[PDB]
Amino acid sequence: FEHATTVPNVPRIPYKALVERAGYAPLNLEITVMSSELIPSTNLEYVTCKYTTVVPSPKVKCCGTLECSSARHADYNCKVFGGVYPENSQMSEAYVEFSADCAADHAQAVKVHTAALKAGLRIVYGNTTSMLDVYVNGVTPGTSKDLKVIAGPISAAYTPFDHKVIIHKGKVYNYDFPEYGAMKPGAFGDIQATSLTSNDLIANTDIRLLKPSAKNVHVPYTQAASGFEMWKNNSGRPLQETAPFGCQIAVNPLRAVDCAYGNIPISLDIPNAAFVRVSDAPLVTALKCEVGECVYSADFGGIATLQYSSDREGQCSVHSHSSTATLQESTVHVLQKGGATIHFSTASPQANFIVSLCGKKTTCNAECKPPADHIVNVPHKNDQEFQAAVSQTSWSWLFALFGGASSLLVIGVMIFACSALLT
Amino acid sequence: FEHATTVPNVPRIPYKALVERAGYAPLNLEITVMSSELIPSTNLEYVTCKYTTVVPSPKVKCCGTLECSSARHADYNCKVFGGVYPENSQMSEAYVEFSADCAADHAQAVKVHTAALKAGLRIVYGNTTSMLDVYVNGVTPGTSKDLKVIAGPISAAYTPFDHKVIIHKGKVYNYDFPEYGAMKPGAFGDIQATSLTSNDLIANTDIRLLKPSAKNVHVPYTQAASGFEMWKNNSGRPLQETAPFGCQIAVNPLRAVDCAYGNIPISLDIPNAAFVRVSDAPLVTALKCEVGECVYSADFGGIATLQYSSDREGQCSVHSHSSTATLQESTVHVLQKGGATIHFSTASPQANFIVSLCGKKTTCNAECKPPADHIVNVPHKNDQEFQAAVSQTSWSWLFALFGGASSLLVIGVMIFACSALLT
């Protein structure tokens, strides 16, 4: 049987629903989203470390002269200084390379295009629970042992990620790194390389060579500082601690785990064998509702009692049809006459919610009192609605005042109409 | 020395320029794009083939009954048919897998994000020709032995490719494959895998079993046909043969070789030692231009004559300033008085351009006769312009024809002014 609802995308908050086929008793539907990783589409441009400057032993002719040419390394500066060390000649050479150990400490400069949308659903229906997952696109079917779910696209696209990103030892940084082979000395990305194994380094360290002047042989040079270490000093906070929806970030493949945004339109194919016809369900009359405390806004400040009358013992499917209150556990063990209890969860001083136990209908009414506790650790479960968050006594005061400011005006214009038509 | 122009993106058609500065003689510049491929960032989802349906030997109990549980396989069907082969029962089961040979023949459902922009320039300056290869974006410098070149981004972005694509044996087909695990039987992408050697074959081929009835043991099954072999019957033409700008496509990394669109703003640093002062080039006065043939638009249908008067004997740098003619060879060995000859390449009925021999600028004037051949292998070296492709005779006809229909209005309103101010 085909049925389609809209799960809200907040992890581990259950969603209640009724599925009914015309000719069958209704049945419960508790759907929860227990994990939601979303995976962007990545590729790596280059891989950065600190340098080590290989300076080989120099070449000196005591009498003749020397020249040297470019070869396959990183930044060269090979100069061929003249008369030195008593005319001799020295040809100094120096070139950077990767550090002694990049296999642990190296940054990756990764680019992020678009995201996938994995999920983690539990579905409880009738007396059967089900563990499954689904790619949230409009077409891919998620199959349980018997049923099939498709999970249409998110109402709004959202990313914690910028277009560029850096992966360090474990941490994820939004930082507009320079493009390939287009680098400045001292900034991030002096040494670039397509992988740790691959060759063809590029470099910009401004390694300048100087004239040697000493009794013993050396080779003098100078260099700007490493840009990667300067960046490690100046790096702010990672995305584990700045992310914009309470999500987490974890990278072996760089996923963002357990966001909280938007809502998932669902569509579900309930198996035909998991129902019951109306010839086996009981019949329910005479629901009324008493309201207890209702100290609102916290978690479960409301307490209400139901009064009912059935024809058998069995199971029913208690369910709210309105959207302000979402009741709890959804299949109450009724008796022939009873007094079962609910827990409201409101966040406004009113109550107008409709209960259907196995086919009936009723209402509730209350006035909710503000709590005396200022700070609490538990998440909300409902949303505020206008024309539901202002107390009815204040509605009466504003209506009386705002209508008294109009009644005299309408009386005046009726006086002018009557006095004109009388002449 | 900094110098910046805009090279039109057409391979193997040279482009002329003069660069100069105060105190030096102008020098030649020929920059010809040789080999310009563009590479888009890709990632593959899944790897499709044909298939073989593994149908193993069945199981039969002579008296008792049988059940079978599922297993980690592909599209897997087991059924447990009852009384048969004179209450014996059989447990038929079958599934599919990749064919005998998919490393040879398989599609790759590559998804294609945006694109990089390599190029292959020839740069000729003075008496030195350099062969480099620049990344076209405004940051990445490309160095020869001595000069440095950056290539600004393309004036207008363009791709032959689409968002999804399918790579067969050597070919590229723009096609919209279904998502991962979102397939229908008898069409493309029945049997998917993230790579060849990996596991997770996902299949919906509608294999269904039948009740056996014979005098020998067998196992009957029906199945919809292979969608991949259905696809190769209906595969159209690859993008080698349908690309939108004459770009070839060859795929080990899926590059789109040799487009022709837009123009590359180049910027360049000429090495300072390859200049020449104003006290070594010959000073040139008294230029004449006797333009000859002008059979325009093909390649080089012009022949002009320079009649000059110089002092020394050396090389001079010849160049057309206006944008309706581009000359050839860009250098002329002068004499003290000579008659050196150029070739124009105009695409208009008028040769109205300015040649400068070594600084002194002179004009050219001719009528250009239409070419006596319809179709020529070499593409155009100039473009058309309104108000420049219209010969002066027709300008005289149109100006006289409009002035005859506009001056008499002035005559009539002066008749109004006369008859009103005299009365």
Coordinates of all heavy atoms in Angstrom, one line a residue, chain A residues 36-45 108-118 159-175 177 238-240 243 247-259:
Chain A
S36 N 22.5 10.6 9.8 CA 22.5 11.2 8.4 C 23.9 11.8 8.1 O 24.1 13.0 8.4 CB 21.4 12.3 8.3 OG 21.7 13.4 9.1
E37 N 24.7 11.0 7.5 CA 25.9 11.5 6.9 C 25.6 12.1 5.5 O 24.7 11.6 4.8 CB 27.0 10.5 6.7 CG 26.6 9.2 6.0 CD 26.1 8.1 7.0 OE1 25.8 8.5 8.1 OE2 26.0 7.0 6.5
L38 N 26.3 13.1 5.1 CA 26.2 13.6 3.8 C 27.6 13.8 3.2 O 28.4 14.4 3.9 CB 25.3 14.9 3.6 CG 25.8 16.3 3.8 CD1 24.9 17.3 3.1 CD2 25.8 16.6 5.3
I39 N 27.8 13.4 2.0 CA 29.1 13.2 1.5 C 29.3 14.1 0.3 O 28.6 14.0 -0.7 CB 29.4 11.7 1.0 CG1 29.3 10.8 2.2 CG2 30.8 11.6 0.5 CD1 29.3 9.4 1.8
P40 N 30.2 15.1 0.3 CA 30.5 15.9 -0.9 C 31.4 15.1 -1.9 O 31.9 14.0 -1.6 CB 31.2 17.1 -0.3 CG 31.9 16.6 0.9 CD 30.9 15.6 1.5
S41 N 31.5 15.8 -3.0 CA 32.3 15.2 -4.1 C 33.6 15.9 -4.3 O 33.6 17.1 -4.6 CB 31.5 15.3 -5.4 OG 31.2 16.7 -5.6
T42 N 34.7 15.2 -4.0 CA 36.0 15.9 -3.8 C 37.1 15.4 -4.7 O 37.0 14.3 -5.3 CB 36.5 15.6 -2.3 OG1 36.7 14.2 -2.2 CG2 35.5 16.1 -1.3
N43 N 38.1 16.2 -4.9 CA 39.3 15.9 -5.6 C 40.4 16.7 -5.0 O 40.2 17.8 -4.5 CB 39.2 16.1 -7.1 CG 38.7 17.4 -7.5 OD1 38.3 18.2 -6.6 ND2 38.7 17.7 -8.8
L44 N 41.7 16.2 -5.1 CA 42.8 16.9 -4.5 C 43.6 17.5 -5.6 O 44.0 16.9 -6.6 CB 43.6 15.9 -3.6 CG 44.3 14.6 -4.1 CD1 45.7 14.9 -4.6 CD2 44.4 13.7 -2.9
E45 N 44.0 18.8 -5.3 CA 44.9 19.5 -6.2 C 46.4 19.3 -5.8 O 47.1 18.8 -6.6 CB 44.6 21.0 -6.1 CG 43.4 21.4 -7.0 CD 42.1 21.1 -6.3 OE1 42.0 20.6 -5.2 OE2 41.0 21.3 -7.0
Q108 N 46.5 18.5 2.8 CA 45.9 18.3 1.5 C 45.0 19.4 1.1 O 44.3 19.9 2.0 CB 45.1 17.0 1.4 CG 45.9 15.8 1.8 CD 45.1 14.5 1.8 OE1 43.9 14.6 1.7 NE2 45.7 13.4 2.0
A109 N 45.1 19.9 -0.1 CA 44.3 21.0 -0.5 C 43.2 20.5 -1.5 O 43.5 20.2 -2.6 CB 45.1 22.1 -1.2
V110 N 42.0 20.3 -0.9 CA 40.9 19.5 -1.6 C 39.8 20.5 -2.0 O 39.7 21.6 -1.4 CB 40.5 18.5 -0.5 CG1 39.2 17.7 -0.9 CG2 41.6 17.6 -0.2
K111 N 39.1 20.2 -3.0 CA 38.1 21.0 -3.6 C 36.7 20.3 -3.5 O 36.7 19.1 -3.8 CB 38.4 21.4 -5.0 CG 37.5 22.5 -5.5 CD 37.9 22.9 -7.0 CE 38.8 24.0 -7.1 NZ 40.2 23.6 -6.9
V112 N 35.6 21.0 -3.3 CA 34.3 20.4 -2.9 C 33.3 20.9 -3.9 O 33.1 22.1 -4.0 CB 33.9 20.7 -1.5 CG1 32.5 20.4 -1.3 CG2 34.8 20.0 -0.5
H113 N 32.7 20.0 -4.7 CA 31.7 20.4 -5.6 C 30.2 20.3 -5.2 O 29.6 21.3 -5.0 CB 31.9 19.7 -6.9 CG 33.2 19.9 -7.6 ND1 33.6 21.1 -8.1 CD2 34.3 19.1 -7.7 CE1 34.8 21.0 -8.6 NE2 35.2 19.8 -8.4
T114 N 29.7 19.1 -5.0 CA 28.3 18.8 -4.6 C 28.2 17.6 -3.7 O 29.1 16.8 -3.7 CB 27.4 18.6 -5.8 OG1 28.0 17.5 -6.6 CG2 27.2 19.8 -6.7
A115 N 27.1 17.5 -3.0 CA 27.0 16.6 -1.9 C 26.0 15.5 -2.1 O 25.0 15.7 -2.9 CB 26.5 17.4 -0.6
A116 N 26.2 14.3 -1.5 CA 25.3 13.2 -1.5 C 24.4 13.4 -0.2 O 24.6 14.3 0.6 CB 26.0 11.9 -1.5
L117 N 23.5 12.5 0.0 CA 22.5 12.6 1.1 C 22.1 11.3 1.7 O 20.9 10.9 1.7 CB 21.3 13.3 0.6 CG 21.4 14.8 0.6 CD1 20.3 15.4 -0.3 CD2 21.1 15.3 2.1
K118 N 23.0 10.5 2.2 CA 22.7 9.3 2.9 C 21.9 9.5 4.2 O 21.8 10.6 4.7 CB 24.0 8.5 3.3 CG 24.7 7.9 2.1 CD 25.9 7.1 2.6 CE 26.7 6.6 1.5 NZ 27.9 5.8 2.0
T159 N 25.0 23.2 2.9 CA 26.4 22.7 3.0 C 27.1 23.4 4.2 O 26.9 24.6 4.4 CB 27.2 22.9 1.8 OG1 27.1 24.3 1.4 CG2 26.8 22.0 0.6
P160 N 27.9 22.6 4.9 CA 28.8 23.2 5.9 C 30.1 23.7 5.3 O 30.9 24.3 5.9 CB 29.0 22.1 6.9 CG 28.9 20.9 6.1 CD 27.9 21.1 5.1
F161 N 30.3 23.3 4.0 CA 31.5 23.4 3.3 C 31.6 24.5 2.3 O 30.7 24.9 1.6 CB 31.7 22.1 2.5 CG 32.1 20.9 3.4 CD1 31.5 19.7 3.2 CD2 32.9 21.1 4.5 CE1 31.9 18.7 4.0 CE2 33.2 20.1 5.3 CZ 32.7 18.9 5.1
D162 N 32.8 25.1 2.2 CA 33.1 26.1 1.2 C 33.6 25.4 0.0 O 33.6 24.2 -0.1 CB 34.1 27.1 1.8 CG 34.1 28.5 1.0 OD1 33.4 28.6 0.1 OD2 34.9 29.4 1.4
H163 N 34.0 26.2 -1.1 CA 34.4 25.6 -2.3 C 35.8 25.0 -2.2 O 36.1 24.0 -2.9 CB 34.3 26.6 -3.4 CG 34.5 26.0 -4.8 ND1 34.9 26.7 -5.9 CD2 34.3 24.7 -5.2 CE1 34.9 25.9 -7.0 NE2 34.5 24.7 -6.6
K164 N 36.6 25.6 -1.4 CA 37.9 25.0 -1.1 C 38.0 24.5 0.3 O 37.2 24.9 1.2 CB 39.1 26.0 -1.3 CG 39.2 26.4 -2.8 CD 40.4 27.2 -3.0 CE 40.6 27.7 -4.4 NZ 39.5 28.7 -4.7
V165 N 38.9 23.6 0.6 CA 39.1 23.0 2.0 C 40.5 22.5 2.1 O 41.2 22.2 1.1 CB 38.0 22.0 2.2 CG1 38.3 20.7 1.5 CG2 37.7 21.8 3.6
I166 N 41.0 22.4 3.4 CA 42.3 21.9 3.7 C 42.1 20.7 4.7 O 41.4 20.9 5.7 CB 43.2 22.9 4.3 CG1 43.8 23.7 3.2 CG2 44.4 22.3 5.0 CD1 43.1 24.9 2.8
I167 N 42.6 19.6 4.5 CA 42.7 18.5 5.4 C 44.1 18.4 6.0 O 45.0 18.1 5.3 CB 42.2 17.2 4.8 CG1 40.8 17.3 4.4 CG2 42.4 16.1 5.9 CD1 40.3 16.2 3.6
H168 N 44.2 18.7 7.3 CA 45.5 18.5 8.0 C 45.5 17.1 8.6 O 45.0 16.2 8.0 CB 45.6 19.6 9.1 CG 47.0 19.9 9.6 ND1 47.5 19.4 10.7 CD2 47.9 20.7 9.0 CE1 48.8 19.8 10.8 NE2 49.0 20.6 9.8
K169 N 46.3 16.9 9.7 CA 46.3 15.6 10.5 C 44.9 15.1 10.7 O 44.7 13.9 10.6 CB 47.0 15.9 11.8 CG 48.5 16.0 11.7 CD 49.0 16.2 13.1 CE 50.5 16.4 13.1 NZ 51.1 16.5 14.4
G170 N 44.0 15.9 11.2 CA 42.6 15.4 11.3 C 41.6 16.5 11.0 O 40.4 16.2 11.0
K171 N 42.0 17.7 10.7 CA 41.1 18.8 10.9 C 40.8 19.5 9.5 O 41.6 19.4 8.6 CB 41.6 19.8 11.9 CG 41.8 19.2 13.3 CD 42.3 20.1 14.3 CE 42.5 19.4 15.6 NZ 43.1 20.3 16.6
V172 N 39.7 20.2 9.5 CA 39.1 20.6 8.2 C 38.9 22.1 8.2 O 38.1 22.6 9.1 CB 37.7 19.9 8.0 CG1 37.0 20.4 6.9 CG2 38.0 18.4 7.8
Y173 N 39.5 22.8 7.3 CA 39.6 24.2 7.4 C 39.1 24.8 6.0 O 39.6 24.4 5.0 CB 41.0 24.7 7.6 CG 41.7 24.1 8.8 CD1 42.5 23.0 8.7 CD2 41.4 24.6 10.1 CE1 43.1 22.5 9.9 CE2 42.0 24.1 11.2 CZ 42.9 23.0 11.1 OH 43.4 22.5 12.2
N174 N 38.2 25.7 6.1 CA 37.8 26.5 4.9 C 38.9 27.5 4.7 O 39.0 28.5 5.4 CB 36.5 27.2 5.1 CG 35.3 26.2 5.2 OD1 35.3 25.3 4.3 ND2 34.4 26.4 6.1
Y175 N 39.7 27.4 3.6 CA 40.7 28.3 3.3 C 41.0 28.4 1.8 O 41.5 27.4 1.3 CB 42.0 28.1 4.1 CG 43.1 29.0 3.8 CD1 43.1 30.3 4.2 CD2 44.2 28.5 3.2 CE1 44.1 31.1 3.9 CE2 45.3 29.3 2.9 CZ 45.2 30.6 3.3 OH 46.3 31.5 3.0
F177 N 42.9 28.4 -0.7 CA 44.3 28.1 -1.0 C 44.7 28.6 -2.4 O 43.8 28.7 -3.3 CB 44.7 26.6 -0.8 CG 43.9 25.7 -1.6 CD1 44.3 25.3 -2.9 CD2 42.7 25.1 -1.1 CE1 43.6 24.4 -3.6 CE2 42.0 24.2 -1.9 CZ 42.5 23.9 -3.1
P238 N 39.1 24.7 13.6 CA 38.6 23.8 12.6 C 37.1 23.9 12.4 O 36.4 24.5 13.1 CB 39.1 22.5 13.1 CG 39.2 22.6 14.5 CD 39.7 24.0 14.7
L239 N 36.6 23.1 11.4 CA 35.2 23.1 11.2 C 34.5 22.1 12.1 O 33.2 22.1 12.2 CB 34.8 22.6 9.7 CG 34.7 23.7 8.7 CD1 34.3 23.0 7.4 CD2 33.6 24.7 9.0
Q240 N 35.2 21.3 12.9 CA 34.6 20.5 14.0 C 33.9 21.4 15.0 O 33.0 20.9 15.7 CB 35.6 19.7 14.7 CG 35.9 18.3 14.1 CD 36.7 18.5 12.8 OE1 36.3 17.9 11.8 NE2 37.8 19.2 12.8
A243 N 30.9 24.7 12.7 CA 30.0 24.3 11.7 C 28.6 24.8 12.0 O 28.2 25.0 13.1 CB 30.0 22.7 11.6
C247 N 26.4 20.1 13.1 CA 26.9 18.9 12.5 C 28.3 18.6 13.0 O 29.0 19.4 13.6 CB 26.8 19.0 11.0 SG 27.6 20.3 10.3
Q248 N 28.7 17.4 12.6 CA 30.1 17.0 12.9 C 30.8 16.7 11.6 O 30.1 16.5 10.6 CB 30.1 15.7 13.8 CG 29.4 15.9 15.1 CD 29.4 14.7 15.9 OE1 29.9 13.6 15.5 NE2 28.7 14.7 17.0
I249 N 32.1 16.7 11.6 CA 32.9 16.5 10.4 C 33.9 15.4 10.7 O 34.7 15.5 11.6 CB 33.5 17.8 9.9 CG1 32.5 18.8 9.3 CG2 34.6 17.5 8.9 CD1 31.9 19.7 10.3
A250 N 33.9 14.4 9.8 CA 34.9 13.3 10.0 C 35.4 12.8 8.7 O 34.6 12.6 7.8 CB 34.3 12.1 10.8
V251 N 36.7 12.6 8.6 CA 37.3 12.4 7.3 C 38.2 11.1 7.4 O 39.3 11.1 7.8 CB 38.3 13.6 7.0 CG1 38.8 13.4 5.5 CG2 37.6 14.9 7.1
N252 N 37.6 10.0 7.0 CA 38.4 9.2 6.1 C 37.9 9.6 4.6 O 38.8 9.9 3.8 CB 38.4 7.7 6.4 CG 39.5 7.0 5.6 OD1 40.3 7.6 4.8 ND2 39.6 5.7 5.9
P253 N 36.6 9.5 4.3 CA 36.2 10.1 3.0 C 35.6 11.5 3.1 O 35.0 11.9 2.1 CB 35.2 9.1 2.5 CG 34.5 8.8 3.7 CD 35.5 8.7 4.8
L254 N 35.8 12.2 4.2 CA 35.3 13.6 4.4 C 33.7 13.6 4.3 O 33.2 14.0 3.2 CB 35.9 14.6 3.4 CG 35.6 16.1 3.4 CD1 35.6 16.8 4.7 CD2 36.5 16.8 2.4
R255 N 33.1 13.2 5.3 CA 31.6 13.3 5.4 C 31.3 14.3 6.5 O 32.0 14.5 7.5 CB 31.0 11.9 5.7 CG 31.6 11.3 7.0 CD 31.1 9.9 7.1 NE 31.6 9.3 8.3 CZ 32.8 8.6 8.4 NH1 33.5 8.5 7.4 NH2 33.1 8.1 9.6
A256 N 30.1 14.9 6.4 CA 29.5 15.7 7.5 C 28.3 14.9 8.1 O 27.4 14.6 7.4 CB 29.0 17.0 6.9
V257 N 28.4 14.7 9.4 CA 27.5 13.7 10.0 C 26.5 14.5 10.9 O 26.9 15.4 11.6 CB 28.4 12.8 10.9 CG1 27.5 11.8 11.6 CG2 29.5 12.1 10.1
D258 N 25.2 14.1 10.7 CA 24.2 14.4 11.6 C 23.9 15.9 11.7 O 24.0 16.6 12.7 CB 24.4 13.9 13.0 CG 24.3 12.4 13.1 OD1 23.4 11.9 12.4 OD2 25.0 11.8 13.9
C259 N 23.5 16.5 10.5 CA 23.0 17.8 10.4 C 21.6 17.9 11.0 O 21.0 16.9 11.4 CB 23.0 18.3 9.0 SG 24.6 18.5 8.2

